[PDB]
Design an enzyme around this catalytic site. Sequence first.
Site, PDB file in Angstrom:
ATOM      1  N   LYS C 156       2.392 -27.259   4.981  1.00 39.10           N
ATOM      2  CA  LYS C 156       1.641 -27.748   5.290  1.00 39.10           C
ATOM      3  C   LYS C 156       2.220 -29.115   6.196  1.00 39.10           C
ATOM      4  O   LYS C 156       3.408 -29.604   5.876  1.00 39.10           O
ATOM      5  CB  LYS C 156       0.969 -28.269   3.753  1.00 39.10           C
ATOM      6  CG  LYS C 156       0.491 -27.216   3.646  1.00 39.10           C
ATOM      7  CD  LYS C 156      -0.549 -26.252   4.449  1.00 39.10           C
ATOM      8  CE  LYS C 156      -1.507 -25.095   3.026  1.00 39.10           C
ATOM      9  NZ  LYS C 156      -1.867 -24.552   4.239  1.00 39.10           N
ATOM     10  N   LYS C 182       6.146 -19.484   3.114  1.00 45.51           N
ATOM     11  CA  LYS C 182       5.455 -18.919   4.996  1.00 45.51           C
ATOM     12  C   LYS C 182       4.248 -19.696   5.438  1.00 45.51           C
ATOM     13  O   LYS C 182       4.336 -21.232   5.743  1.00 45.51           O
ATOM     14  CB  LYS C 182       4.397 -18.074   4.241  1.00 45.51           C
ATOM     15  CG  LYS C 182       3.089 -19.236   4.140  1.00 45.51           C
ATOM     16  CD  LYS C 182       2.164 -18.334   2.718  1.00 45.51           C
ATOM     17  CE  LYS C 182       1.853 -17.071   2.838  1.00 45.51           C
ATOM     18  NZ  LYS C 182       0.484 -17.944   4.392  1.00 45.51           N
ATOM     19  N   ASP C 184       0.975 -20.345   8.075  1.00 51.79           N
ATOM     20  CA  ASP C 184      -0.200 -20.223   7.588  1.00 51.79           C
ATOM     21  C   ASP C 184      -1.146 -19.830   8.460  1.00 51.79           C
ATOM     22  O   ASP C 184      -0.136 -18.707   9.806  1.00 51.79           O
ATOM     23  CB  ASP C 184      -1.308 -22.316   7.965  1.00 51.79           C
ATOM     24  CG  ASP C 184      -1.416 -21.537   6.799  1.00 51.79           C
ATOM     25  OD1 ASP C 184      -1.932 -21.177   5.994  1.00 51.79           O
ATOM     26  OD2 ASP C 184      -2.918 -23.251   6.799  1.00 51.79           O
ATOM     27  N   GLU C 185      -1.228 -18.627   7.956  1.00 57.68           N
ATOM     28  CA  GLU C 185      -2.574 -17.433   8.517  1.00 57.68           C
ATOM     29  C   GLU C 185      -2.713 -18.316  10.507  1.00 57.68           C
ATOM     30  O   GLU C 185      -2.715 -17.695  10.732  1.00 57.68           O
ATOM     31  CB  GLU C 185      -3.710 -17.625   7.548  1.00 57.68           C
ATOM     32  CG  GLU C 185      -4.813 -18.000   7.914  1.00 57.68           C
ATOM     33  CD  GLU C 185      -4.713 -19.322   7.074  1.00 57.68           C
ATOM     34  OE1 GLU C 185      -3.716 -19.276   6.635  1.00 57.68           O
ATOM     35  OE2 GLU C 185      -5.131 -20.646   7.616  1.00 57.68           O
ATOM     36  N   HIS C 275      -1.660 -11.385   4.697  1.00 61.68           N
ATOM     37  CA  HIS C 275      -2.675 -12.456   4.737  1.00 61.68           C
ATOM     38  C   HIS C 275      -4.530 -11.853   4.599  1.00 61.68           C
ATOM     39  O   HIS C 275      -4.729 -10.999   5.996  1.00 61.68           O
ATOM     40  CB  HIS C 275      -2.145 -13.175   4.970  1.00 61.68           C
ATOM     41  CG  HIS C 275      -3.058 -15.269   5.166  1.00 61.68           C
ATOM     42  ND1 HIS C 275      -4.625 -14.738   5.220  1.00 61.68           N
ATOM     43  CD2 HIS C 275      -2.877 -15.261   5.114  1.00 61.68           C
ATOM     44  CE1 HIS C 275      -5.051 -16.312   4.727  1.00 61.68           C
ATOM     45  NE2 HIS C 275      -3.747 -17.103   4.656  1.00 61.68           N
ATOM     46  N   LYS C 315      -8.948 -23.186  -6.007  1.00 61.35           N
ATOM     47  CA  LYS C 315      -9.901 -23.628  -4.404  1.00 61.35           C
ATOM     48  C   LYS C 315     -10.651 -22.643  -3.693  1.00 61.35           C
ATOM     49  O   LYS C 315     -11.530 -23.237  -3.119  1.00 61.35           O
ATOM     50  CB  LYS C 315      -9.013 -24.449  -3.551  1.00 61.35           C
ATOM     51  CG  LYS C 315      -8.799 -23.820  -2.943  1.00 61.35           C
ATOM     52  CD  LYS C 315      -8.054 -24.431  -1.400  1.00 61.35           C
ATOM     53  CE  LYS C 315      -6.876 -23.771  -0.243  1.00 61.35           C
ATOM     54  NZ  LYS C 315      -6.109 -24.682   0.593  1.00 61.35           N
TER      55      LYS C 315
HETATM   56  O1  LIG Z   1      -4.798 -22.008   3.738  1.00 62.47           O
HETATM   57  C1  LIG Z   1      -4.582 -21.820   3.004  1.00 62.47           C
HETATM   58  O2  LIG Z   1      -6.066 -22.428   2.101  1.00 62.47           O
HETATM   59  C2  LIG Z   1      -3.405 -21.993   1.916  1.00 62.47           C
HETATM   60  O3  LIG Z   1      -2.480 -21.861   2.897  1.00 62.47           O
HETATM   61  C3  LIG Z   1      -3.393 -22.546   0.673  1.00 62.47           C
HETATM   62  O4  LIG Z   1      -2.728 -23.679   0.812  1.00 62.47           O
HETATM   63  P1  LIG Z   1      -1.991 -24.517  -0.098  1.00 62.47           P
HETATM   64  O5  LIG Z   1      -1.509 -23.828  -1.607  1.00 62.47           O
HETATM   65  O6  LIG Z   1      -1.709 -25.530   0.262  1.00 62.47           O
HETATM   66  O7  LIG Z   1      -4.032 -24.342  -1.124  1.00 62.47           O
HETATM   67  C4  LIG Z   1      -3.683 -20.033   1.547  1.00 62.47           C
HETATM   68  O8  LIG Z   1      -3.636 -19.556   2.684  1.00 62.47           O
HETATM   69  C5  LIG Z   1      -4.379 -19.373   0.837  1.00 62.47           C
HETATM   70  O9  LIG Z   1      -4.950 -20.695   0.070  1.00 62.47           O
HETATM   71  C6  LIG Z   1      -5.632 -18.656   0.954  1.00 62.47           C
HETATM   72  O10 LIG Z   1      -5.186 -17.072   0.683  1.00 62.47           O
HETATM   73  P2  LIG Z   1      -6.246 -16.435  -0.005  1.00 62.47           P
HETATM   74  O11 LIG Z   1      -7.706 -16.598   0.221  1.00 62.47           O
HETATM   75  O12 LIG Z   1      -5.860 -14.841   0.792  1.00 62.47           O
HETATM   76  O13 LIG Z   1      -6.093 -16.094  -1.368  1.00 62.47           O
HETATM   77 MG   LIG Z   2      -2.697 -20.233   4.770  1.00 61.60          MG
END
Ligand SMILES: O=C(O)[C@@](O)(COP(=O)(O)O)[C@H](O)[C@H](O)COP(=O)(O)O
Ligand SMILES: [Mg+2]
Lengths: 448, 448, 448, 448
Positions: C156, C182, C184-185, C275, C315
């Site tokens: 992040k 990783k 981010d998507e 993902h 979340k």
């Molecule tokens: O973009 C995000 O929110 C994350 O990088 C989490 O970051 P944090 O750990 O900082 O919250 C993940 O991609 C997800 O939680 C969604 O995964 P999924 O919905 O497939 O479980």
């Molecule tokens: Mg992500």
Amino acid sequence: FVAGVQPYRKTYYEPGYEPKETDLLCAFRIEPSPGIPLEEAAAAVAAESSTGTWTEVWSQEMTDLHRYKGRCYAIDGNTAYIAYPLDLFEEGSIVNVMSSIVGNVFGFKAVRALRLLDMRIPTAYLKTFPGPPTGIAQERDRLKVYHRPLLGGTIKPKLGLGPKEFARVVYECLVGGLDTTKDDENLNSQPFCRWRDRYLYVMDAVHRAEEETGEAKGHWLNVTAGDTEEMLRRAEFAKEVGSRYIMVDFLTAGFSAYATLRRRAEELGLMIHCHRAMHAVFTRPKDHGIHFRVVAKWLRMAGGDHVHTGTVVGKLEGAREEVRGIADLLREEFVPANPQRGLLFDQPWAGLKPLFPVASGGIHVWHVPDLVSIYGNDAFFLFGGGTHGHPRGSRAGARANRAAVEAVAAAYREGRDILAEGRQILQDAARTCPELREAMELWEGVTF
Amino acid sequence: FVAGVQPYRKTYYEPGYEPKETDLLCAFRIEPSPGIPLEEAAAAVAAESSTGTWTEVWSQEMTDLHRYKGRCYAIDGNTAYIAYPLDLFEEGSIVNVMSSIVGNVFGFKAVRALRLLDMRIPTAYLKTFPGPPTGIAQERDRLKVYHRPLLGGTIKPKLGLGPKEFARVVYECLVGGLDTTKDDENLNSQPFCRWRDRYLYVMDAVHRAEEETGEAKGHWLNVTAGDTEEMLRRAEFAKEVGSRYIMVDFLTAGFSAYATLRRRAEELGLMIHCHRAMHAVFTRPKDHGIHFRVVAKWLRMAGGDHVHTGTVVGKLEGAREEVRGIADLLREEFVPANPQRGLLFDQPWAGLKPLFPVASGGIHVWHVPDLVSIYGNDAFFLFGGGTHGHPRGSRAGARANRAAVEAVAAAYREGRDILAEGRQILQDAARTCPELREAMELWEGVTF
Amino acid sequence: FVAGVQPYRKTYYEPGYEPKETDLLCAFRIEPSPGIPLEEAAAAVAAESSTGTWTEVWSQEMTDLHRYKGRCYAIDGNTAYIAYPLDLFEEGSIVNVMSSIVGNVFGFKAVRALRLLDMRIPTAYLKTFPGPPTGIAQERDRLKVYHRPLLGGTIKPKLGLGPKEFARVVYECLVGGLDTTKDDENLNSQPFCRWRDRYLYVMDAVHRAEEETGEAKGHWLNVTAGDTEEMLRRAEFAKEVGSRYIMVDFLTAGFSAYATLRRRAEELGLMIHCHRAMHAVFTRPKDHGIHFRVVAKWLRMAGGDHVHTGTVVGKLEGAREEVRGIADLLREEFVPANPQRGLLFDQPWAGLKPLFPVASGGIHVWHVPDLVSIYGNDAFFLFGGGTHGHPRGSRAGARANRAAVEAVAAAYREGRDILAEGRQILQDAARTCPELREAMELWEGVTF
Amino acid sequence: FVAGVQPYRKTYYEPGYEPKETDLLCAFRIEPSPGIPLEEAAAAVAAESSTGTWTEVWSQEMTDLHRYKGRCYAIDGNTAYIAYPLDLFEEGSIVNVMSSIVGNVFGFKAVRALRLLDMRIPTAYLKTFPGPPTGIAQERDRLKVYHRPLLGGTIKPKLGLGPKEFARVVYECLVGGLDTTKDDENLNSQPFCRWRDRYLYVMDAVHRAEEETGEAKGHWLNVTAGDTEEMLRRAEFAKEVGSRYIMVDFLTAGFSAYATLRRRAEELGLMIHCHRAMHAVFTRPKDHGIHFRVVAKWLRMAGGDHVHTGTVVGKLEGAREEVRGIADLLREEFVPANPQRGLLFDQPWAGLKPLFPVASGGIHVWHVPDLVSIYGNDAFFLFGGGTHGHPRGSRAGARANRAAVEAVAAAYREGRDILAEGRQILQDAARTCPELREAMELWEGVTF
Ligand SMILES: O=C(O)[C@@](O)(COP(=O)(O)O)[C@H](O)[C@H](O)COP(=O)(O)O
Ligand SMILES: [Mg+2]
Ligand SMILES: O=C(O)[C@@](O)(COP(=O)(O)O)[C@H](O)[C@H](O)COP(=O)(O)O
Ligand SMILES: O=C(O)[C@@](O)(COP(=O)(O)O)[C@H](O)[C@H](O)COP(=O)(O)O
Ligand SMILES: O=C(O)[C@@](O)(COP(=O)(O)O)[C@H](O)[C@H](O)COP(=O)(O)O
Ligand SMILES: [Mg+2]
Ligand SMILES: [Mg+2]
Ligand SMILES: [Mg+2]
């Protein structure tokens, strides 16, 4: 042109014919059907393997039949000798030879039974084949193993082991004393053990064993697959992961796919182990099929580095003299005819490299003398169940087998009658090898 | 883990086992060696085809043997039924199936003789195979031949004809009435007739015959070669010269090379004729080998458009009921077990396309009724010597064979008992076909 | 053929139908539109997913409708079960399955709402898919991490970091204790961080962390791109720069592109992280869309090594029992039906490898117990904000997360009730881990 | 850097922000969870779609957050407008746009429901996309059809027809008056109809219809497959067999695979039909998912020649004004905002070619007026059941549909109120078209 059915012997039986040095000679044990004379049966075999059909055809006027026809030039007992002109066969193609000699003549009603015993491959036709890519001497140099039969063992159980456990067994066997290991002929790529994972884990194990022991080690990774492209991809990966060995079931996979794989492996610098799976469906019967000496000749022409030849004393059927003849065919540059060993032709090899006979199947330490008597030093002894079936594990079994092989080879080099003094040699070796003692005790009375 | 030799039946004989719909079932006619009980022999076959070896191995503790082992679940007379888990077999690989089922069990001393009679291929394993690329209906549409057995003929003599003379015979046969022609299984590429020249001349002849007759014509050009790459090159050339057909000796060439060739031919839009040369070395004996119904199943899985199945009344051995069962296996989407025909399992085909049975070998006009009785309309009738052996030439023989086939097919469609009225049907056809009359006169008493 | 509109239930509602083991079964929660009976709605869904349209068509006389039609064989409450013949689906194509089952039936006016809850993939259809290329055990062996959930974290902020700063954060996280990291998507290739530079810098950081820590480390480089060729090029580069991991947004990229990438990655020896971005647009609603268990089955068939499954306590929305069922689907070789967990079918996996559930999204140390309760040890716990949001930096956060995961896994292995003693376990771990204490203090009352 | 959780609106809610012409604007209908203010929900959506996570991270000090963050700049009712900087998105990648905008924000507990209504693609980002390869005018020139909606029809039944019967239906429809035909979205390659055979038979039928009618004809061969390489191979074959059209399920296949296929088809000169199978799983709900106008924009950017847009009066749900807006988006070079039609942004297209809206699903002759009112002339009208469900067969149904379309288009060109005079126009056309009369009688009261 006279239309109608005529006896085969009228044209395809030529007792006075003298075979040419360029002719391809086949010996057939023939059991004719009732009412069919043996001469007629042999003539039918020659005709329907070379040029003839069940009735006269006008088209015969458009070619020199006598120049191209195959003919039976001799009949000793039930064994008919048939000569085929060199021009009948495609250069460098075992497939064409099989489609001609053993194509359709074995299914004829006129012959109750038909067995192809021996074949005389002419030097001219032999020169069209590549032969083994490595050879016995080059393989020994690569493994740095001399004056000793090369040890190996199929990893057991045949199926159900995962890549990690499979490689663990491989490592134990290699560190225990085995020069090489191999995948089972039926272990290619399965849900329990995919070929990529098996290759990676096994090569890691092989490298670890090489580092620990300091001796050259290898695993005969099985590249046999349902398509030639997959086999080539698996061989390329085997080279990528550092393997110096691959193995293929040439009969089940095929001689064309095997030729492609042999070319690719020679390009890649890989030694090819040849497994003869499915041979016994047509090499075992004494009255019908193809004797394995012919298949051994075909494999040597096609270019195998090692091929299974039999154990005699093991769990799979095999005759001692026939196995000796097959070993001579695979290892010698010229094999004279030997009726005792079933070799009915003098077989030159036109400089084609020799390959390693492999003894596998239900053989343990007690069988080592006999094997060395049958094969000598230029052979591979495979102990699958004899290695992993040891009470203390695969490492102990490999150590015991290595000790037995070394002791028997030393006695053989010394001129001792290993056949008569084999038990004493094994006992003396076991005096300093507890693993050998345990292996001997476990399988003392185990005979086939 | 207890080291030592234990009976196979202790682990690999499970009479109470109920086969799963996903299991692969094999029926084995077993003749055990003296002192070996039949149950022990069947257990040995299962063990050494699936997971077991001659002695217990510690490595069995690293896998679930009972989940992966093959087991004999029934013994009726000398026929043992063995079930193999689906996970034992590589997806889409006849080679792996052969290396497992018919790999080494046929050479065991414990069994005097072993024959694989029938196999139950599960739907799950079948879905991993492509099946025939064209199918019966698509082939008929391509040839525009319906409600009639498709005529053909091997060009004779088998060898010695040059490309020009070979193509002349092909043209005469095709214009005479044959739908297709084929190279002999042993005619691949030879000094007297190289494959390129033969392909060019033969396709010129085929195009001329198509133009003159106005009907679709083809020649089953033989792409069999000593290497897979050469076979692919020959198939590509066959497509280039306009051929809609190729033929290959899948057993001699191999199932891996055959799979590669089938993929390439489907890409090229070529129909593949499958010649079963070398099958009789292991399909003829009643006590040892592999019954050809199993090979037919394997070929249908591997994707052949036509395959030889037998003539019964011809020069090559074949049982009527077994041939009927094989034809049903090749043509039907589901074949129920039929002990009379030797079908010991209900065999689904999972939507795999049907292929054409081919009747060839010592068959002339008089055999047409029986053939139509055995095969009906969805089959290929090959007249090699019956075409070229006609007194007036190959054209007249092809015309006679076409007339006989058409007359018998018309009678069969009308519900007439062709088996009893075949001679009358042929005579009535010959009343208007002098070529048919001459062919009938020439081969009136010719029987095998 | 009778032209006109007929009710679907007349043909596509078969309550007495018994599903075959080869049939593909779908469970649909249906909310029909007013005036449309539930049976009619289910029949419409089956018809318009398998063979039927809004009116009768003459062409139905040209095929066996009853053999190919999908039919609703049961209706429990608002949940309709529909069976589809195996022959309706292309082998090894999730795309075809989606185009059939979820193609157009969700937009029909007759159904106010439609949700695909569960699917029964038959073993025969499963055997046509490759499954995950690596598997849980192989991945653990590659990482040498056992008896512990595998730690990770998304770097992040999601976007705006340059390659150097991104790799600095990656190095801090990996050295702090995270097993992997990783992209981010949504981080694929952008002006602020191009994919080539990110790959190079990140792999340098990963190698440095591996050298310093001595443990296997990796980064899930995102190869997602606007075209399949670009994704393949990025995966090839990732392999070139030494990465053992890649990640792809399979839903947004697509199942066809994902299948191509999976084949290429298996060739390259790369582990693929999956993902599920964009899943919540159709997996969240309780009345419409596709439940994520079906998508998990599809991904396991398509061959993912890890896939996101939910956090429950994080979340993002997720049900505990549904997540447990999804984890069992992804990890077990056979999942029996469990109405409590929403699994309405017994699901075999035909030997397909298991893959890693991934828990990500708003999870910090306090959530570790619950996660371990939900998933156990065979799972990936991703801490993006929980790592970088630590007061002392990403290294301290990674150390805290590693300590919490290790402590909770040790308690779970000991049989302790981690759900009840989780706070005590975390406090005891923090007694010796100041980073864990700080993380616990910061996010004590942070709940979703 | 202050560690801890902070409200999203503190940073990602910027009501005074003025969107830049280069920014990408998204409109979200948000239903926040209880206790979550709408502003907080919109800020959370922006943050977790662009740069933010659930807690503050030190790494934010390493980049300009305010330059890259997405922010909600307006909230009208429940609709929040969020601006994303152009630099956040990878050039020419719909996959990246989806992974950002609709990646994870739809699964957040903070928002009970989330729907993406409209998107403002900036000209700068649009210039990075290729757009449709052919366009409306070029397609009309290829088909030589002007001043008239283009007729088509899905071949029915959806599955179970063999290649021969399928091509027979195709030929009947094309000769009857349909300009094109198509494979159903779920018909890709199945045992009953393999793709190669279907392509060959269908192209033979198309060529025959072109020769007989003298008008350009085509069939939208479905190249959708489980892998991108298979789709490319099928498109290449479609070009080889002479097809000017291919179709793909871009949502199920994927946007990356679709981009690869579009590049290959533009290279091959093939027009691509885009089927929106699986859209209704996330485009139907009014409170959650993605409105299909956004998907239409994405498809136009990705380069489809035609795309399904809805029938309104058919069997599948669709709003009239929304469909009009989608048609304008697909066909116009600039679409001003229209709140009545749901278009919340002025959408330039930067010279990207227009594509054909396709109306399909439960539409017969009586629906032709409404369709022409909704779409005008630049559209495709697909009659699957309306063609084959005709009492006299597919040819008669195609003739009736062609007559109705021609009559209604002529009336529309004349300025007549087709909505009010549609029944009279259809009756007048039927006075000279008995097929149209029969179709009107059969489906007079059939409404959805
Ligand atoms: O973009 C995000 O929110 C994350 O990088 C989490 O970051 P944090 O750990 O900082 O919250 C993940 O991609 C997800 O939680 C969604 O995964 P999924 O919905 O497939 O479980
Ligand atoms: Mg992500
Ligand atoms: O499957 C087996 O039986 C083996 O692995 C031996 O295992 P064990 O050493 O454990 O008996 C070998 O393949 C054979 O003996 C057959 O070779 P061939 O017939 O060609 O000689
Ligand atoms: O070589 C031959 O004998 C043939 O060309 C027949 O020629 P004729 O028609 O002139 O007899 C065929 O290959 C076989 O009959 C064997 O086929 P199969 O054993 O597979 O049935
Ligand atoms: O499967 C079908 O239902 C169709 O073939 C229509 O057949 P009929 O003409 O016989 O009804 C079309 O694919 C759709 O209408 C869905 O298109 P979309 O939802 O994209 O508009
Ligand atoms: Mg073996
Ligand atoms: Mg022949
Ligand atoms: Mg459709």
